[PDB]
Amino acid sequence: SYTQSFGYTIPTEKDTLEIPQYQALLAKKASYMDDSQGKNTATYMNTAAPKDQPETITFGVNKVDNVYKQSNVQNQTFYASSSKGTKIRIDGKRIWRTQSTDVNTGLPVIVDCPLWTSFTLGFADFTLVDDSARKSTIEWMISQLELLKDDGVWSKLCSGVTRIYG
């Protein structure tokens, strides 16, 4: 009889996030661009956005030779039979565009500033890993953002608070 946990019982209490269906729209309107960003990385243009103001998401998957060196596993005996791991990465680059017509000339004045986001998940490639394990850790990150509170972990990071909890 064996048990495999992250180390603590998953909290019963659940924060509910009402997230807009961005992905659905993007999936409908995503057109394949050439994979400039990497060899095993495929870049995608979102056609729903305008041609002169594009939003692009690039997917990548890179295998990592030794997972344990990066990670903090206390004792070396616990190391699994093979330390080869797989790592996934979602990069997205979108544009927050401000535009207003010039008073002097009807030509609009456009100034768009860029915003970008990146999500990464690396996991030791073994059979001791479940999609249960991986989806839990994804949810762990998302919860760690504290998105429900307007002035929360994410706003403090944006506002520069490194030492969040003390």
Please give the residues from 120 up to 159 whose contact with a copy of itself meets the rule CB under 8 A.
120-131, 133-147, 150-151, 153-159
* Smallest distance from a copy of itself to CB 46, Å: 8
* Smallest distance from a copy of itself to CB 24, Å: 7
Length of the chain equals: 166
* Smallest distance from a copy of itself to CB 156, Å: 5
The yes or no reply on residue 65 touching a copy of itself (CB under 8 A) is: no
Residues followed by a break in the chain (C to N exceeding 2.5 Å) are none
The yes or no reply on residue 114 touching a copy of itself (CB under 8 A) is: yes
Chain positions 25 to 54 lying near a copy of itself, rule: CB under 8 A, are 25-27, 29-36, 39-42, 44-54
Q: Please answer whether residues 75 and 54 qualify as being in contact, where contact means their C-beta atoms are separated by less than 8 angstroms.
A: no
* CA torsion through residues 7, 122, 68, 144, sign: negative
Report the 10 Å Cβ neighbour count for 56: 18
Instruction: Return the residue matching tokens 């030509």.
Output: 107
* Smallest distance from a copy of itself to CB 149, Å: 10
Q: Token pair for residue 90?
A: 């979602």
